Structure formats: C-alpha cells, structure tokens
Design a protein around this ligand. Structure first.
Ligand SMILES: O=c1ccn([C@@H]2O[C@H](COP(=O)(O)OP(=O)(O)O[C@H]3O[C@H](CO)[C@H](O)[C@H](O)[C@H]3O)[C@@H](O)[C@H]2O)c(=O)[nH]1
Length: 579
C-alpha cells in the first residue's frame, strides 16, 4: 500500500542530517525497483511505523535524540513534597464499621467499573518460559492469574463486564490460547495488542539491526495502554460506549498481583468520598524496592505543582543529591480513575503520555550501549495530564501485605532476602495468598489457630514459607470477597473448626454452618450463583490431607511452575462433598 516512490522518499529522508540512518542502506541500489524483498521489507517496515507511532520513524528518531540528550544530566525537581491528597485505608483484616461502609460502597461501585489488565510484559526474570498471567495464583487449585481476574470481574460486574487486556507480540498468542483453553466466556472483553518500536544501537540514535539484518524491536512499555484504548472502537470509540452504558470508573491492574481484588473496592469508595479524579494505590515503601514514589512535584522553578509517580530508579538518582520507610508513599500501579475525567484527558492527549529512555551502558566511561535501547513509557504517567487546577489526584495507602507481586526468581529472591529485602517470588506470592484468605476469614470470626513457623524452606535454605491451612473459596462461593460476602459463607463461624494442617476447597453455591475438618475437603455446590445453596451442617471430616515438601537439590513430573517456587504440594487424600 505504499508508493514504490514513497519508500524512496522515506529512505532519502532518513539519510538527512539529524536523522542519519544511512547505515541502514549500506550497499544498496539507487532506487526501489532494484531492491530485493528483504530490503523492501525493511523500507516498508520503516514506512508503516507511521500508523503505529505519532510522526512515524522520523519523529521516533527525533524523540530519541531529545531523550538521549537529557540522559547525560541529573534528574532534578525544583520541588518535591508529600502529595496533598493522601488517604489511609482501614485494615483489610478488621471488620470495623468504616471498613464495612467502605467495602459496601466500593462493592456497589464495582457494577459501574471498567477493568483494564496490562499483560504485554515478559518479566524476563523468573525462570518461567510462558506468560505471567498463565502462572497459578496458588497451586491448591492452580487458578491462573488470568482466570482469577476475569472471574472476579464477571462476579462483581456481571458476565458482560467491560474488560480490556493489553497484550504484546511477546504475550498475545499465548494469551488468546489461554482464554480459549480456560473456556472463559467474556462478551465485552477487548484484547488490544501494543506495537513494537525500534531500538537504538547508540547514543546518536542510530537504529539497531540484528543478525539476519532486520530492524530490532521491543515494546514501548505499559504506557501504550491509553492510546490503544483511545483508538479502540466497538464506528464508535470504546470509551464512548462505556460512558453511554453508564460506566463511572476505570481501573488498571498489573499481571501478577492478586491483592488488587481487595484494594480496589476500598479505593473506589475513597475516590467517591474524596472526589478523586485519579487515585494511586499505595503502600508504605522500603528504601530499596522497585516501586515508584507518589510525590507532589515541580520539575522547574516556575511550574505548578503536579502530583505524579517518580520511579524508583529516578528517585535513586534524584535522591543522592537534590534537597524505616520512604518519605513518600510507594505506588503499586493499581490505578483508579473517575471514568469521565479519564476520558476527557484521553481525548485531549490521544492517550499519548510522556516518554523516557533508560539505556544500559556497557562500561562506566563511554556512551556505549551494552544492548540496544528503546523509548519507554509508564501507564501511571498519564497523571501528568491532570493539572492540580482542574483535577483532584490522590493516593490511598494500604498495608504492605496487600501488595503481592510475583516478580523475582528464587535466586534473586534469596539475594534480596539476604540483604533484608522483599522476595516477591512465586513462593511468597502463593504463601501470601493463603495467609490473606485466613486473615479475611478470621476478620469475620472464623476461629483459625495456626503456627507462624515456615513449613518448607526454599532457595537452598535461604528462607522458609508456610502454606497451611489452605482455604480457597471460588467466586461463586465467595462472590466479591467482601467481609459481608464471606460471612454469608460462614453464618455461624464459631462452629467451624479447621485444623492448621487442613485444606478446604469450596466451589459454587455453598454455605458452611458447622464443620470439624482435620484433613482435606472439597465441597461443591450449584455453579449457578442464583441457585439454592448446598448447606453443610455438623460435618466431621478426617483424612490424611495434603502436605508440602521442598524440591531437593538432587520420569520427572516437576514443571517450571513447581521449580520457581521451590516446593510441591502433595495432594495425598481428599474428601469430596457434592450436590
Ligand atoms: O511493554 C510492556 C511492559 C510491561 N507491561 C505490563 O505492565 C506491568 C509491568 O510492570 P513490571 O512488573 O515489569 O514492573 P515496572 O518495573 O514496569 O513497575 C511498575 O510496577 C510497580 C508495582 O509492581 C510500581 O508500581 C512501578 O512504579 C510501576 O512502574 C505488568 O503487568 C506487565 O505485563 C506491558 O503491558 N507492556
């Protein structure tokens, strides 16, 4: 679709001063006809980038110059202090009137919430060769992150809940595969794939080629979600459709943090109470960790205050000069917006947000790259488009325990923990999930007594976790997971006695009035949320149950999934109560 001469015009353009991409056409004919398909592919690839990126490859290159220039100086702000609008969430594990009030208000708002999942990233770190959303939240049920979010959203927002997943060339096909394999039926799901952008071989923004002689490419960061949304249609823009259907909020979540289903209702309630246009999910931050800081900022001496995330790496550089937790809250990138305000800023900017570049240098001396570098962007930087004059931007501070990402391999985690840092590995992610259920259930009066000692040690005796007792209630059973919803499952919790070594798995419409459990038990009820619940009374269950042991340093059934957590559950015995 591009003029054979239009390709020639772009090639000439790219050789001009300030663009200087001649090294791309080294040893080429004069015109387009004489070029092999492998050369027209590149020249075409360069031409098409225009519909993927504002100003095409020429502007990409200019932007690189502008960013790389800036990448020899020290980041600095004229001013930095605490954001004016910061609110502290009540504890997730105390059923106070306030918590009850916030959960109820927040849970009602879930009916009018659009959900967005950014899942284009690889997280090269883990020891896991498949996509992050295919990781199990926990291995008792092996429910994937993808299923976990989607089933929760359809539970709180109905089957027709609006749901966006951003994929990339790294995750797209496997994400569609998983959707199909899981038999997930989500009528208003939209899968939007972010584009690839070019890499710079050097500090002069010369485009990088690979071995086969083709242009090297990477995605442009989680920042692209806003433009994908802006350009998406359902001949009507997606966001118009949402607004017309009466949707009032939009929430952005990341690929491996199961905590979001707990924090989100509270954030919605507080946004409403405090009229927040944008509401950053925060936690108290420990000095070293890879989460940004929520700050009130002024980049230059004359500017207006601007509430925004300052990334950990940048705060690390801003810190050591310009003047047990950090002075400002840590931002975990569950982002909660008032939909109408979100859309207004989206329409103004076309979803375009500030960009940056962060080259990894080979040595400490030269502007020489250890690997090619591309321009990036952060989805949270849309905050910069919300002036303090026109908008209310704030943070809600939750318990650190509510932030449970799976980011690090066991070896990094051991290294992190050895320096007293957060592990954020698969083992602590699964263990945190089980403990979270237990804290919530105790909050409504379930008498769980259990040891705090670890039961298995991972990463060559670096640290231990514990798993038991394991209690996992599905979305039909637990509905939204609010404390009121959990109380519906256990109407008389003082009669339910689950031993510390037990496993209780509950699926479908179930009420448990009274139970003595020493062992493992699955209880299944009607999958139809609107059916007559299967009620359990005076149940007494005892069997060998389950156990856990470490994968030893030494017909193998161990998968990467087992290996990245360093232990395996042995699912020895299991009673089943169906009906
Ligand atoms: O091109 C990309 C890159 C990443 N992602 C997605 O966006 C999230 C990526 O975040 P990372 O886990 O790789 O971590 P970041 O270092 O990008 O940090 C972000 O996550 C942190 C909390 O985990 C803090 O909130 C921080 O301030 C914020 O920038 C994941 O769901 C990932 O799949 C994309 O969709 N496209």
């Amino acid at each position: 679709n591009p003029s054979n001469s239009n390709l020639q015009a772009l090639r000439e353009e790219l050789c001009t001063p300030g663009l200087d991409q001649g090294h791309l056409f080294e040893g080429w004919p004069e015109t387009v006809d004489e070029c092999n398909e492998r050369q027209i592919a590149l020249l075409t690839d360069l031409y098409m980038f225009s519909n993927m990126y504002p100003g095409g490859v020429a502007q990409y290159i200019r932007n690189g110059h502008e960013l790389l220039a800036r990448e020899s100086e020290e980041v600095d702000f004229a001013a930095l202090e605490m954001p004016p609008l910061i609110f502290e969430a009540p504890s997730l594990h105390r059923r106070t009137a306030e918590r009850t009030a916030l959960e109820n208000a927040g849970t009602a708002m879930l009916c009018k919430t659009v959900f967005v999942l950014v899942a284009g990233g690889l997280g090269e770190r883990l020891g896991y060769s498949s996509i992050k959303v295919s990781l199990p939240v926990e291995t008792a049920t092996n429910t994937t992150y993808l299923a976990y979010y989607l089933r929760w959203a359809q539970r709180v927002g109905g089957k027709e809940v609006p749901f966006v997943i951003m994929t990339s060339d790294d995750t797209h096909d496997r994400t569609l595969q998983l959707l199909r394999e899981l038999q997930l039926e989500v009528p208003n799901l939209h899968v939007l794939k972010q584009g690839q952008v070019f890499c710079f071989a050097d500090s002069a923004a010369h485009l990088a080629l690979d071995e086969t002689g083709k242009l090297l490419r990477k995605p442009h960061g989680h920042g692209d979600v806003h433009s994908l949304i802006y350009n998406a249609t359902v001949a009507q823009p997606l966001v118009n459709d949402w607004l017309a259907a009466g949707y009032e909020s939009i929430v952005f979540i990341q690929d491996t943090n199961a905590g979001a289903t707990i924090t989100i209702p509270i954030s919605l309630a507080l946004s409403a109470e405090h009229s927040l246009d944008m509401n950053f999910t925060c936690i108290p931050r420990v000095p070293k960790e890879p989460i940004g800081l929520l700050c009130r900022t002024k980049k230059n001496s004359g500017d207006p205050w601007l509430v925004a995330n300052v990334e950990y790496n940048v705060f690390a550089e801003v810190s050591r000069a310009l003047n047990g937790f950090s002075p400002f809250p840590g931002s975990v990138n569950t982002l909660v917006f008032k939909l109408s305000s979100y859309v207004d800023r989206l329409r103004e900017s076309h979803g375009i947000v500030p960009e940056f570049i962060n080259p990894k240098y080979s040595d400490e001396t030269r502007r020489s790259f250890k690997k090619p570098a591309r321009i990036e962007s952060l989805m949270q930087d849309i905050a910069l488009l919300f002036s303090e004059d026109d908008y209310r931007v704030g943070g809600t501070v939750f318990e650190r325990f509510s932030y449970q990402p799976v980011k690090n391999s066991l070896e990094e985690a051991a290294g992190l923990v050895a320096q007293g840092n957060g592990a954020y590995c698969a083992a602590t992610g699964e263990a945190a999930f089980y403990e979270l259920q237990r804290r919530r259930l105790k909050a409504i009066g379930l008498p769980l007594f259990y040891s705090s000692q670890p039961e298995v040690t991972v990463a060559k005796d670096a640290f231990g976790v514990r798993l038991f007792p394991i209690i996992v209630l599905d979305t039909v059973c637990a509905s939204s997971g609010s404390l009121d919803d959990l109380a519906r499952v256990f109407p008389t919790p003082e009669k339910v006695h689950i031993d510390q070594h037990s496993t209780l798995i509950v699926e479908g419409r179930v009420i448990i009035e009274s139970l003595e459990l020493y062992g493992a038990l699955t209880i299944r009820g009607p999958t139809d949320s609107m059916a007559l619940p299967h009620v359990v009374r005076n149940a007494v269950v005892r069997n060998a149950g389950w156990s856990v042991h470490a994968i030893l340093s030494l017909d193998s059934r161990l998968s990467e999934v087992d290996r990245i957590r360093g232990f395996v559950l042995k699912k020895t015995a299991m009673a089943v109560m169906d009906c």
